[PDB]
């Protein structure tokens, strides 16, 4: 049906039902988060606050996942065991990481109920990303005492970051248990993040998939790829801004410097991906808490294996946390080559031309000659175009399916990115 007949029913078929479902899904999680935020302001003993958030986490998990929340609860218990047995050693990170690895593998063998296991990962993952975190923050000395059972449980089951919420370090949660005054910036941040989450949801559901035929007079295999990539990006940004809102509602996600308290828990920066500078900025700004967790607790450890062999292990860990699907695993493996080759090639180009063409906008104290020349703008724009093209290629797998689906979807595109990356690596090794 034509554009007019589409827009005549757009609002009644897309704008109201999508937002209705988006609000019906979270009207209870937001209520529980607000109840926790208000309850943690009565000057209660800390153990009672941790017990309250444990109860809230149980109730929230039960409300989302009917009774399969055991596959999370169990994990939590298991984690604490591996934290209490090796509490004295300096291997806490390694033991907790091996436990998480064994648990996720034993889960991905598709023995236990998979219809609901494959939809709890978004929560289960977080728990893992928390436990391992502590296991290393105690080793390097960034956390003093091994927490008591109630503190650890109230950390894993933090009602703000249990369902969608991002990973937050143990100290960034302890400083939330103390609680901060209900300022106006707090409500402002919560409302802004909720509005942006709803906007990204309604913009991903059916303004994305119907982008180029109707919203554009253009219309193929590349246009569908780009619209699928945009739909996927915004379907993520929904969860991102919603997690940011639920974590700023429960009290967490705030920095303080020179008695200045600011709520700036950023999870996803959409303007660094839709108008990208480089694929490194796309990856590290697709999910900021996870992009910091992986760089700090996986890459920095496996760095002994060599730079590339550590980047690849980091992407393997990221493809294991998200849940192993062949399209997602292929994307998160190709991203390793793409990002590494682009980074090192831009590095060589900047060292040769003495220009500011690094994969990140340099600091003001760089030793480059061409800081703002038109050639620098042209190179940055060409690499941004390559980044948009890599995104439109990779995100084509997430339309709305094992090796056959991926091979077919990438054969319709004639393997454009996997040849552009090879060409860029050849170009890098030739001008070496």
């Amino acid at each position, epitope marked *: 049906f034509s554009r007019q007949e589409f827009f005549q029913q757009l609002l009644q078929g897309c704008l109201l039902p999508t937002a209705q479902q988006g609000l019906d899904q979270i009207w209870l999680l937001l209520a529980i988060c607000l109840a926790c935020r208000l309850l943690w302001r009565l000057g209660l003993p800390s153990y009672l606050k941790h017990a309250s958030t444990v109860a809230g986490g149980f109730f929230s998990l039960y409300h989302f996942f009917q009774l399969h929340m055991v596959w999370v609860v169990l994990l939590s218990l298991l984690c604490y065991l591996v934290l209490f047995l090796c*509490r*004295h050693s*300096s291997h806490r990170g390694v033991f907790l990481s091996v436990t998480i690895l064994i648990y996720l593998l034993m889960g991905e063998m598709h023995m236990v109920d998979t219809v609901t296991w494959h939809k709890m990962r978004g929560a289960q993952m977080i728990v893992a990303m928390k436990a391992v975190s502590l296991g290393f923050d105690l*080793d*390097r000395g960034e*956390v003093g*005492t091994v927490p008591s059972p109630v503190e650890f449980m109230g950390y894993l089951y933090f009602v703000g970051t249990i369902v969608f919420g991002p990973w937050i370090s143990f100290h960034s949660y302890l400083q939330a248990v103390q609680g901060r005054p209900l300022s106006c910036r707090w409500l402002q941040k919560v409302a802004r993040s909720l509005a942006l989450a709803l906007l990204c949801l309604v913009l991903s559901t059916c303004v994305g998939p119907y982008l180029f035929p109707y919203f554009i007079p253009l219309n193929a295999r590349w246009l569908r790829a780009y619209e699928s990539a945009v739909s996927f990006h915004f379907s993520n940004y929904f969860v991102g801004f919603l997690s940011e809102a639920t974590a700023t509602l429960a009290g967490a996600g705030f920095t303080e410097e020179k008695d200045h308290l600011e709520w700036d828990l950023t999870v996803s920066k959409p303007l660094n991906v839709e108008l990208p500078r480089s694929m490194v900025e796309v990856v590290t700004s697709w999910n900021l808490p996870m992009s910091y967790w992986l760089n700090n607790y996986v890459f920095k*450890n496996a760095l002994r294996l060599g730079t590339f062999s550590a980047v690849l292990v980091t992407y393997a860990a990221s493809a294991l946390l998200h849940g192993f699907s062949f399209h997602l695993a292929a994307v998160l493996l190709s991203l390793a080559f793409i990002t590494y080759v682009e980074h090192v090639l831009r590095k060589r180009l900047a060292r040769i031309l003495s220009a500011c063409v690094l994969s990140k906008r340099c600091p003001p104290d760089c030793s480059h000659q061409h800081r703002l020349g038109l050639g620098v703008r042209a190179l940055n724009l060409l690499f941004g175009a390559l980044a948009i093209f890599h995104l439109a290629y990779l995100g084509s797998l997430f339309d709305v399916y094992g090796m056959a689906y991926t091979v077919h979807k990438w054969s319709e595109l004639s393997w454009a990115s996997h040849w552009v990356t090879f060409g860029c690596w050849i170009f890098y090794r030739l001008i070496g």
Partner: antibody
Amino acid sequence: EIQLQQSGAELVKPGASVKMSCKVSGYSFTGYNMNWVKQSHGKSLEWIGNINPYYVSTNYNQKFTGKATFTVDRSSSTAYMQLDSLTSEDSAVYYCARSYGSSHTFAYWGQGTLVTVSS
Amino acid sequence: DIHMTQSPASLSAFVGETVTITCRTSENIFSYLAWYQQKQGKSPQLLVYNAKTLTSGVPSRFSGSGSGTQFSLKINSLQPEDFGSYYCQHHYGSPYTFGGGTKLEIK
């Protein structure tokens, strides 16, 4: 019995570098963190930093970064700290201390080396 | 950085009295705080950790208590070998900072 033997006193010219040594004996060296602490004369203690002997990642105090570097020797179970560009403000006693394990309190202390900077 | 103040800077009592040293923390540490004792010319020794738990081999007269931003060590029935500097040191997270140091002296 746990014993953290330490090097002898040092007298260094201003601007030079010094390298201490804390030899551990009494437990598995790669089991617990090793903190380095500085105490002036008649003053309070200051936490220079720590090193994890299992994986050699370190953790410095921001006031002592770039001035003290930590290294380890697992074969002889010895933790070294190197102070660079010493001034007259670094004449103090330096202790090594094994973390308690569960908590990060300094359970077993060394004996300290007196580092004096003069001409 | 967490600023730890400690009071009093220097006190003096007879043998067999009861003394209370206080440590006030700028930020809020939940219960993470240790008390070390250092005699004249020796390395410190861990006396109390978690602000109440006594270490292995310490007499039962050292009784530390408190929580939040106000902790206190209580030395009752003072003994001759209990004279020296006492440092409070939080262990809530790097970087750990020590207190000023109360110097218990003879009287």
